[PDB]
Structure formats: C-alpha cells, structure tokens
Design a protein around this nucleic acid. Structure first.
Ligand SMILES: [K+]
Ligand SMILES: [K+]
Ligand SMILES: [K+]
Ligand SMILES: [K+]
Ligand SMILES: [K+]
Ligand SMILES: [K+]
Ligand SMILES: [K+]
Ligand SMILES: [K+]
Ligand SMILES: [K+]
Ligand SMILES: [K+]
Ligand SMILES: [K+]
Ligand SMILES: [K+]
Ligand SMILES: [K+]
Ligand SMILES: [K+]
Ligand SMILES: [K+]
Ligand SMILES: [K+]
Ligand SMILES: [K+]
Ligand SMILES: [K+]
Ligand SMILES: [K+]
Ligand SMILES: [Mg+2]
Ligand SMILES: [Mg+2]
Ligand SMILES: [Mg+2]
Ligand SMILES: [Mg+2]
Ligand SMILES: [Mg+2]
Ligand SMILES: [Mg+2]
Ligand SMILES: [Mg+2]
Ligand SMILES: [Mg+2]
Ligand SMILES: [Mg+2]
Ligand SMILES: [Mg+2]
Ligand SMILES: [Mg+2]
Ligand SMILES: [Mg+2]
Ligand SMILES: [Mg+2]
Ligand SMILES: [Mg+2]
Ligand SMILES: [Mg+2]
Ligand SMILES: [Mg+2]
Ligand SMILES: [Mg+2]
Ligand SMILES: [Mg+2]
Ligand SMILES: [Mg+2]
Ligand SMILES: [Mg+2]
Ligand SMILES: [Mg+2]
Ligand SMILES: [Mg+2]
Ligand SMILES: [Mg+2]
Ligand SMILES: [Mg+2]
Ligand SMILES: [Mg+2]
Ligand SMILES: [Mg+2]
Ligand SMILES: [Mg+2]
Ligand SMILES: [Mg+2]
Ligand SMILES: [Mg+2]
Ligand SMILES: [Mg+2]
Ligand SMILES: [Mg+2]
Ligand SMILES: [Mg+2]
Ligand SMILES: [Mg+2]
Ligand SMILES: [Mg+2]
Ligand SMILES: [Mg+2]
Ligand SMILES: [Mg+2]
Ligand SMILES: [Mg+2]
Ligand SMILES: [Mg+2]
Ligand SMILES: [Mg+2]
Ligand SMILES: [Mg+2]
Ligand SMILES: [Mg+2]
Ligand SMILES: [Mg+2]
Ligand SMILES: [Mg+2]
Ligand SMILES: [Mg+2]
Ligand SMILES: [Mg+2]
Ligand SMILES: [Mg+2]
Ligand SMILES: [Mg+2]
Ligand SMILES: [Mg+2]
Ligand SMILES: [Mg+2]
Ligand SMILES: [Mg+2]
Ligand SMILES: [Mg+2]
Ligand SMILES: [Mg+2]
Ligand SMILES: [Mg+2]
Lengths: 77, 95, 62, 46, 91
RNA sequence: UAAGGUGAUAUGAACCGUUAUAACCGGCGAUUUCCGAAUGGGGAAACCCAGUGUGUUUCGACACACUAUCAUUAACUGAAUCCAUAGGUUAAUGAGGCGAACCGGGGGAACUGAAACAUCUAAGUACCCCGAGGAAAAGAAAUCAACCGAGAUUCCCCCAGUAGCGGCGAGCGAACGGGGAGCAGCCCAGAGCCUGAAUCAGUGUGUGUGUUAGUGGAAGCGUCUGGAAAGGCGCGCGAUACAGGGUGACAGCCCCGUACACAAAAAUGCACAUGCUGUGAGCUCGAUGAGUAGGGCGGGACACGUGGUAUCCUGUCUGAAUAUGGGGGGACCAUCCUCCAAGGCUAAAUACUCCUGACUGACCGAUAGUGAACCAGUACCGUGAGGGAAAGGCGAAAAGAAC
RNA sequence: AGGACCGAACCGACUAAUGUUGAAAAAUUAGCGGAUGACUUGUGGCUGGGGGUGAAAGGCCAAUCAAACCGGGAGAUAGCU
RNA sequence: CGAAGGUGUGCUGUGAGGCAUGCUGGAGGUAUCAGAAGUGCGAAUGCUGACAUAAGUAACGAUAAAGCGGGUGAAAAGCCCGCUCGCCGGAAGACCAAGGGUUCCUGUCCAACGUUAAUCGGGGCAGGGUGAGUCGACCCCUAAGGCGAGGCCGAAAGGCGUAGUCGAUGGGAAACAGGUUAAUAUUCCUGUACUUGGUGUUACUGCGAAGGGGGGACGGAGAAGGCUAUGUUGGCCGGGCG
RNA sequence: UACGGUGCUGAAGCAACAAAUGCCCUGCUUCCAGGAAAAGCCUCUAAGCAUCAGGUAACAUCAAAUCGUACCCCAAACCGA
C-alpha cells in the first residue's frame, strides 16, 4: 500500500473544491519513492519505500536510528 | 415430601364420593391418586364390556384419615431419630 | 455395581468387558430372531459395558 | 419451450454450495445472516 | 488383525425375507444386517469368529431408508447395510 | 432428596425401587462420532486420499498419536559472495473462528429540505471496513479566566434557540459562567544516596459472607343450593403468613406456596487477614520530548460556509527558540495575565443487553400481541441473495360412546 | 473443390388458419429457409449492473431491462387523486 | 336460585342510546363519581377470512377407435382374462446419461388425489427389493479455468500471481456366454476367462530420478478396397394336408 | 397345473448371395484455415547403493477396499404451478 515506511504517511481523503464550491471527494497521496539507503554498519543497501519527508527524517536522525525504530514497530525491511 | 402416600387410608373431602373412605392404591405425578372403591367410572371397553374402574382424584380432595379421632386430618413433618416422619396436626401424633 | 467392579485389575475388567460384549451380541441376535422375551436385559448389559469402560478409564487416569 | 431452470447438481454446488459460500467474506456473511435468521437449511448443499 | 470388540459390533441381525430364505436354500448364503461402516473383511472375520463357519465371500449393499409420514409429519428411516455372506460348501 | 420410577406425542411391553447405588435435583469428573476456524493434503460441508512414528499381528492386516498457516523467540543449518546476510529445518509460545447492542478508528451516499437548483441541507446519518473491552474513549492544563480567580477527564440540569454561522436563504447553532453526579492522581526521558521497605499484580492457606441442590413452615367445621362448593347462611380459628397458583363454581385455615426460621460433601465469586514470587518507597541533585512549534500551498475540523478569522489536524514544500526560552488570551501589535506542546499510564460518575433470576404494568388477548400461543424462520415461493404463511379452546374427569 | 445444388435428421421462423378465461404466459396444423458451415450440439468454464455481452434490434444479462434482482437509507418526496 | 356473549319481545328518552324480560349460554360482570384512550366505519380499484353471482353454464387437454364374452365386485364403458378391431414402428419400440428419488415388486385399502366411475393407479398403508478385482465413481493424469506458501500491488475489505494444488466435457489395468428373482444382475449361479499389485521360493542379473529422450499425440474433406453386423434365398430338421 | 406357471426331454443347427453410416482406418489421398495437455507406458543415465538392495523370468500364495447399482428417462417420474 502507499505507506511511508519511516513516517507512516498514507493516502488521506479530502475535497476538490471548484470556484462554485462544488465538493468532490479526492485523495492526497504521499510523495513516495523506493530508495536504496547505504547502511554502513551492515555494509549493505536497504531499500525502503519512503516519502520525501521520510528521507529528510533519515538525513536528520540517521539510517541506523530509523531502522532501529522500524524493527521496534514490527516494520519489515 | 408427599403428605399422601400409597397405602394410606384417606377420606374424600370433595366431589360425588365426599365422606367415603379408602386406601390409596397409586399416586400419579400429576397430583392425583387412585383410591380403592372411590371415583368409579363406567368404561365402554372395546373387545369387551362396560367395566367399572377407579378414576384418579385430585390429591387435595382427600385427607389422611385419623383412625383415633375418626375424621379427616392434616399432615405435618417432624424429625424423629434423625428421620423425617409424618404426624397428624390434630393430636401431634406420628403417622 | 461400580464398587464391586472397582476391586478388579485392568486385566479382570478387560475380560469382564469382553464377556459383556459377547452377551450384548447374543441378546441382540435373540431380539432380532423374535425370541428375546426379556427386553430389559438389553439396557442392563449396555449400562454395564459403560460402567466397565468408565472404571478402565479411571484406572488409566484423568 | 426451454425454461430457465436447467438443473445440474455440480453447477448448483459450485455456484451456491457451502464451500462456495465459505470461500469469500460476503459468502460468509450470507451464512451468518441465515444462521441469525435460524434457517434449517443454510445452503443448497443439504 | 481385527479386534474382537470390533467384530462383536459389526453384525446387527439376521435379515428375514423370502429372498434371504431362498439364498440360504439354493446358494448356502446367509443375509445379515451389518453396521453401516462394516467392510467385507470385517464381516467375514466376524461371521467366522462368532458363528464358527467358513466364509467363501461377502457381498454387500447399502439399503437407503424410506421416506414415511406419521400423521402429516415427514420422516425418513435410516440407511442400513446388508451383507450376503456365502458360506463354504460343507457349512 | 425419595416412595415411587424407566423424557414427549403415547399407550403398552419388559422391568427397576420402597430406608437407601430406583428415579429425580445440584457440585465435581468420565465419555463426547462426523462436518464446521477445521488445522496432514484435497473437496461439490458432514466426504475422498496420505505421510511419519510407536505398539500389536493369527502375515490377511490392526490400533493409537502426530503432521495446517502466520507471528515471535531459540537452536541448528546455510546462497549468489570472502566474512556474512537472505534462505532452510526443528522446538517453544501465541494467534486464527463465532457473537444482539454499546465503544474507538478507516472510508462514506442519496432520496430529501431549500416550495426549481448548483453553495448549503439531509449528515459524518445509512452503509462498508478494521480493532477493543466489560465497558470503551477521555484524562491530570503549552486549560480557562480577566487583573478577581478557577484547577485532570466523563456524565446530567442550566446558560440559550442566546452569541454567532448562513445563496445572512432553507437551515445550522456554541462558549464563558452557574447548579449537580463522581472524584485521584502518577510514571519515564538518570544518576547518586540509602537500600529494596511502598503500592499494585501473581500464586498459596486461613477468615467470614454469598452463589450453584435443599429443610421446616400456622389455622375449619356444620348446614343450603348444586353434577361438583371454595359460593350463601351459621358458628370457630391462624396471621411477622390475606404475595401468588391449583383444586368439579369465588378457599387465610384442602393442596403447593407465602412471612419467618434454617441448610452444603463439592466447586466457585467476593471482602478481609496472613505467607510467598516479582514490582521496587523515600531523599538530595539533575534533566525537561525537533523534522517538532511556526510558515507557504491544498484540503479538512472547530456552532464559525475564508470571512477582518484566532485555534486544531495534515497531503505537499519548508523550518525555530529550546526556560536568559516557548504556547495561549478569536485578525494584528504593545502591555499584562496565564500555562509549559512535540513521551506515557490512570478508578469512579457515563453507554449498552445476545443471555440468567426475580418482580411489575389504566400493555395485547388468536385478523391483536413476536413473523411464530400450535414441531415457524416451518410449509411454501425463488438459481440465489432472499421472501415467508395459515393454523389456539370436548369435558371436572376420557367417564372418548360396550352392545 | 465449394460460407456449391436438391433434400431428411438437426438448426431456424416467411405466410395463413386455429388458439387468445389457450393443450401452450408465444404453441399447433399446412406450407416455408439453412442443412460441410461465418454450421449445429453436450459437459464444464469466464465476463456483473452505468457494469457485462451485442454480425447493433437499445437486443440480451433466469417468463424482469433506456440501467437486473435482493436487502437496506425508507414511513424518500407526492402544492396530486 | 345463572355473569358476559348470542337471539327475541315489551317499555322508554330530542338523539347517540337506556331499562326490563323469554329463550340460548354456562362464569363471569360491575353501579356511582372521577381518570386514561389502539374509543365508534359503508365507501379508500382499502386489508384478511367466509360466502354469493354468472350456472349446474363453459370445459373434461390432440378426431389412434373401438366391439363383445367371461371374471371379480355393493357397483364394471374404463380393472383382470379372452377373441376381434384400430394406432406407432429412425417410434408412440429398446438401452442410458442428465435430472428426479422409492415412483420399482407384492399384499391390502378407495376418504382425499386421478378433470367421470373405479374393484384400477405413479394415490393411502404395510412388507419386500438394488449383491461387482473386471460396469461406473473414487483413483493416477492433465484442458479451459479456479485457488494459491512466499511474492508484487492496493485506505481497509481486497487484487494479481510464483512454487504448487485443484479442476472433465479428454488420456490411463482387466469378463464373457448361458441360467435364474414377484422385483438385481457383465454384480447371484453354471461354464469358460482375464488384469494389476503384495509376499514366498528358484534362478539369473546393474539397479537406480523431482532429470534426458521416445511414446502417448490428435484437423477438414474425399476415395477405394478388404470385411463384419445384418438380411435374403436354398439346403437341412420338425410339424402340416386345410 | 394352485389355468398363474413350473417340471422333464430335445431334431436340424449348413451353404450361397447381398450388404452398412459399423470395423480395417489414430489408415490412405488431398487441402489450408495447419489441427490439446499431462500421466500411465518404453528407454537412458545422475546422485546413491554395491557377494546389499533393486532388476528380470517362472512357479506358488495372498489381495483388489469403498461408494453407485431399484425405477422413470423425448417422459404421467426430468424442465414447464
Ligand atoms: K442533494
Ligand atoms: K420543493
Ligand atoms: K359451605
Ligand atoms: K381440593
Ligand atoms: K387459594
Ligand atoms: K509543518
Ligand atoms: K508568556
Ligand atoms: K402473522
Ligand atoms: K444499474
Ligand atoms: K342472557
Ligand atoms: K367503575
Ligand atoms: K370496502
Ligand atoms: K350455481
Ligand atoms: K362414470
Ligand atoms: K470397483
Ligand atoms: K474410494
Ligand atoms: K381350403
Ligand atoms: K442394477
Ligand atoms: K438417467
Ligand atoms: Mg462374487
Ligand atoms: Mg457394491
Ligand atoms: Mg483444509
Ligand atoms: Mg483435514
Ligand atoms: Mg480476535
Ligand atoms: Mg428542492
Ligand atoms: Mg481506557
Ligand atoms: Mg494569579
Ligand atoms: Mg418443605
Ligand atoms: Mg403450610
Ligand atoms: Mg363452570
Ligand atoms: Mg515539555
Ligand atoms: Mg500552536
Ligand atoms: Mg503545521
Ligand atoms: Mg497561521
Ligand atoms: Mg493552512
Ligand atoms: Mg479549511
Ligand atoms: Mg495568538
Ligand atoms: Mg398472529
Ligand atoms: Mg375467537
Ligand atoms: Mg450450401
Ligand atoms: Mg433467432
Ligand atoms: Mg411447421
Ligand atoms: Mg438456397
Ligand atoms: Mg437444402
Ligand atoms: Mg431506435
Ligand atoms: Mg428475459
Ligand atoms: Mg438510473
Ligand atoms: Mg431518510
Ligand atoms: Mg411512502
Ligand atoms: Mg380506531
Ligand atoms: Mg364492515
Ligand atoms: Mg363515508
Ligand atoms: Mg367467484
Ligand atoms: Mg348462459
Ligand atoms: Mg350451451
Ligand atoms: Mg359442452
Ligand atoms: Mg382425454
Ligand atoms: Mg365387458
Ligand atoms: Mg363406491
Ligand atoms: Mg375407454
Ligand atoms: Mg384386452
Ligand atoms: Mg410413496
Ligand atoms: Mg407399479
Ligand atoms: Mg373420482
Ligand atoms: Mg403406490
Ligand atoms: Mg490468484
Ligand atoms: Mg490433480
Ligand atoms: Mg470424463
Ligand atoms: Mg428391472
Ligand atoms: Mg455375415
Ligand atoms: Mg454420415
Ligand atoms: Mg437397472
């Protein structure tokens, strides 16, 4: 499913609104990308499906901390 | 426990045979008794003949007959020698 | 007759069980032939089999 | 003239039988409704 | 090796009929009602043990029970198994 | 607990029992086919077909147990590929499915109203989906207030159809503050000191008190009518019992009860008390939740429809200060007041009733009341989902009509 | 050889009469077209409702079709009778 | 010593109504003054049940067709037996699959069912009846297609699909003739066969798969020859002399 | 003979001719539209076992379970009340 493995961001629903304020249901999707992250501690690449926001989280916190969070949530990588 | 039992001498309180005495022959779980010589019906028996027989009477329509007093009585329950006994309410005497 | 059956070993209960099952077979055949007068024997042997099997399982364990 | 009901026990059981009902969540909801109603016959199976 | 307990349950009754009577006269064949899950092997073993006769062969069939009415209430009799047990020539 | 009993239509047959293994009632056990999550594989449910291991065998066979999947953990094994990692195998632990409502969450209509209709309404309703519990959720102020003060959350009555929102239409509709129900506060983000004392759990045994069978339980006769008396008439008696039901018409005293007084071998709830396993009180000294707050864009939520619009949530792009600091006080600024987000737990008052017991009704009484007083979710209809009836009363007693 | 010819089975359905509370909710009788093919038929399978399928008639999708059936929103709404 | 209800009759008030009482009925009823409403029916092509009308009318379901004698019986156009007649005969005969499920056979019954009567029945009731190594299923094998460990995908539900595993309408061992029951028969019996597998013995010997190859294994049309099923005629045998 | 049907006995039992849409034929000829799969079966070896097993042949012996089987089936029994 379209779920960020780092942040848990997923599709949310809302409205399109016309100029006449006609509401039609829409979705807002996360900006997801499959990305190979270098994990220096394992001498390995780990692929995560991550939002652009999740990539900024990884840049800030570091991949090792994030993967530690993933294991503790039962999030498989 | 039952106040009226098989082989008790009873007197009829109610009905066509009011006042008559007889021995209880059967106690039915419906709350009725067959009393010897009481509540006779003429059954037209298919082969065969018209046969007189006892019909069951409501157990509340008979009373234990107290031979000493010569009249209907009520039963109470007491424990004597650790065993439950019946007694006549009239005279407190064990049945 | 549980109390009297209770003072027998497993081996004695197993031979007792076989006797009852053979008796049950013979009565079943007699009832089928139209020759069993005493229909009450059928229930008696059936309940005796149950009693032996109960005690075999007690002497096994629970 | 050829009428609409043309019986086949195999097609009956595959279309509507107990195992067909159990194979999907919506089929299991059919069985739940019919149990709740107290139907003697849950499916065409029996 | 079929246990005696099992053998004591498989034979239910002799089947009494004109066909069964003729089977015994003409072909030395006894007709039995047997347990619905009795196999030919079990029936053979039971007859040999319990009636003390040599069996040649067992043929079997399942009798489907009749639908019956008992005062505007539909009912069905039970299915049961019939065994034609052919005894050997001397028996 | 017992003088009767072997459930019903439903008699009979063959029996069992009467002083205590007849039956009946309750506690604890035993047995518990096959299908069904169904789990050894398969399958058109109630069937078809295996493997493995033991044990029996009369050599024909036979019995019993185990063998699903996923998650977690552990061990062993083990690629491309060096170490490895993926993968594999086995063991242990757990899950799975079902269930009427209530509860939290993910999605989410339209008819309709606006006397048309699109904003708006209906409505975050119906419905679908996920998850939980006996309740759930919420909860210990980055809350309100107004310079006086209050002091977590939840629920009830007010405030008020007010203030507002609104094609300023139809409609939608607060809060502040007040009266009540119920009340309870804590822990981590960390060491040290002294120690493991506290309070919760778990697992034992006392101790009452309940529950799941039961026991005793008062006192009425005569006469009249009548098929029958419980009715009339006459004269008695009980009442901590005149609740109720039955009995040949309407019974306090005929029967079963009722008030009242008692009872448990066994299992089990509860409340205590007292052993035991883990949980570790208190005190000085720190520390104080960042892709976060805030912002731009798009939406949503707030009674509040973008409006002059605070506040909350975030799909997207960004991005602080971090106690000398930060949030809020309905655009915004200053001042003042007040609070401390980005970690978490927490009883009660609140919601509901598939189900169990008791009791009640100016509720129905067979076209009513459940669809169903009755063998009804049946018969019957439909490929199926699904739809879905009609149908109660002899008599006090079968004495159910011998001939 | 052949979407060749005549013609039964088989598949159709041009005309007429009958029938129209039918023998039948589409038939019967006499005639009629195709009949080695773009044929016909058995068994099983797949496509699902604004969807299918359609040598195209809005045809067909269980005697229902310009939006199936069943249950629900639901007592929609009804300035009308 | 007769409640409600039912049904008559009399009296009575301006009305809705009221009162009394005969008969039926056989156990309930309820003044007064207050209180509450599922409180009043002729209509709604209203709803349910009952019963009319048309009417003893139409019709009795292929125009293949009956006639008579005897039997049984309460009763015979319809049943049974017999003779004759007619109808089908690429079917209106026979055997099956599918589907149905006891309708099969025997005895007994005639209420209802059967478009009439019914002694008859696919009707009621009871009893009986289905026999397999070789027929079929199951089973081994796969087609379309289905499901699908992991997997990939998707707000949730779920979608797709790999290994696999299911799935016949197709591929895969073997039995025939005669006889027999009221009712089964390639299943029973008689006679004569065949298949596959497990053991044992004897002898000899390279056996061995989740792999390779072969085979299984395949269209339409047409033509000709060789045959048999089968028929016809003769011969033969038994009977016949109208 | 119980007018249902049993029971005992049994002759000839050959040839010619005609002849399928059935068989040889999953053939042959021909055409284009170019006509399942997988197992059983036969054969080959791999790893492995190796005076073992296994294989093949003959003979003997045992086994072949379970479920269906009545009856209608162009129809009064199925689909059409
Ligand atoms: K609307
Ligand atoms: K309007
Ligand atoms: K009296
Ligand atoms: K009485
Ligand atoms: K009373
Ligand atoms: K932000
Ligand atoms: K401040
Ligand atoms: K009803
Ligand atoms: K539609
Ligand atoms: K009256
Ligand atoms: K009153
Ligand atoms: K009317
Ligand atoms: K008439
Ligand atoms: K007639
Ligand atoms: K077989
Ligand atoms: K099988
Ligand atoms: K002549
Ligand atoms: K058969
Ligand atoms: K058939
Ligand atoms: Mg045989
Ligand atoms: Mg068989
Ligand atoms: Mg399974
Ligand atoms: Mg299984
Ligand atoms: Mg669960
Ligand atoms: Mg409008
Ligand atoms: Mg909570
Ligand atoms: Mg202050
Ligand atoms: Mg008592
Ligand atoms: Mg008393
Ligand atoms: Mg009375
Ligand atoms: Mg903080
Ligand atoms: Mg903020
Ligand atoms: Mg923000
Ligand atoms: Mg802002
Ligand atoms: Mg914004
Ligand atoms: Mg907004
Ligand atoms: Mg502000
Ligand atoms: Mg009703
Ligand atoms: Mg009535
Ligand atoms: Mg042509
Ligand atoms: Mg056409
Ligand atoms: Mg024609
Ligand atoms: Mg032409
Ligand atoms: Mg032609
Ligand atoms: Mg048109
Ligand atoms: Mg149609
Ligand atoms: Mg539409
Ligand atoms: Mg609505
Ligand atoms: Mg309406
Ligand atoms: Mg009314
Ligand atoms: Mg009326
Ligand atoms: Mg009117
Ligand atoms: Mg009429
Ligand atoms: Mg007329
Ligand atoms: Mg006329
Ligand atoms: Mg006429
Ligand atoms: Mg006719
Ligand atoms: Mg005649
Ligand atoms: Mg008659
Ligand atoms: Mg005729
Ligand atoms: Mg004739
Ligand atoms: Mg029948
Ligand atoms: Mg018949
Ligand atoms: Mg008639
Ligand atoms: Mg019949
Ligand atoms: Mg799939
Ligand atoms: Mg398979
Ligand atoms: Mg097949
Ligand atoms: Mg036959
Ligand atoms: Mg020939
Ligand atoms: Mg031809
Ligand atoms: Mg047959």
């Amino acid at each position: 499913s379209r779920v960020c493995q780092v942040t848990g961001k997923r599709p949310v629903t809302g409205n399109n609104r016309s100029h006449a304020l006609n509401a039609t249901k829409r979705r807002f999707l996360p900006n997801l990308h499959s990305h190979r992250f270098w994990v220096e501690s394992e001498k390995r690449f780990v692929t995560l499906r991550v939002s652009a926001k999740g990539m900024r989280v990884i840049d800030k916190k570091g991949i090792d901390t994030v993967l530690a969070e993933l294991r503790a949530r039962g999030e498989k990588y | 426990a039952a106040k009226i039992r098989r082989d008790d001498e009873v007197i009829v309180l109610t009905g066509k045979d009011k006042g008559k005495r007889g021995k209880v022959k059967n106690v039915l779980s419906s709350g009725k008794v067959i009393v010897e010589g009481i509540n006779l019906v003429k059954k037209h028996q298919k082969p065969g003949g018209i046969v007189e027989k006892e019909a069951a009477i409501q157990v509340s329509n008979v009373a234990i007959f107290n031979a000493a007093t010569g009249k209907a009585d009520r039963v109470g329950f007491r424990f004597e020698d650790g065993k439950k006994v019946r007694f006549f309410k009239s005279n407190s005497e064990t049945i | 007759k549980a109390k009297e059956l209770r003072e027998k070993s497993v081996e004695e209960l197993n031979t007792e069980l076989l006797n009852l099952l053979r008796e049950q077979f013979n009565l079943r055949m007699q009832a089928a032939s139209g020759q069993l007068q005493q229909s009450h024997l059928l229930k008696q042997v059936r309940r005796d089999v149950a009693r032996v099997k109960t005690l075999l399982n007690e002497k096994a364990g629970a | 003239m050829k009428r609409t009901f043309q019986p086949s026990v195999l097609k009956r059981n595959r279309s509507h039988g107990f195992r067909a009902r159990m194979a999907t969540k919506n089929g299991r909801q059919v069985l739940a409704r019919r149990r709740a109603k107290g139907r003697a016959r849950l499916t065409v199976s029996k | 090796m079929i246990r005696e307990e099992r053998l004591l349950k498989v034979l239910r009754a002799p089947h009494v009929s004109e066909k069964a009577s003729t089977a015994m006269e003409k072909s030395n064949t006894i007709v039995l009602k047997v347990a619905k899950d009795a196999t030919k092997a079990e029936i053979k073993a039971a007859v040999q043990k319990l009636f003390e006769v040599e069996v040649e062969v067992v043929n079997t069939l399942v009798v489907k029970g009749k639908v019956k009415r008992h005062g505007q209430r539909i009912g069905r009799r039970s299915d049961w198994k019939k065994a034609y047990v052919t005894l050997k020539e001397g028996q």
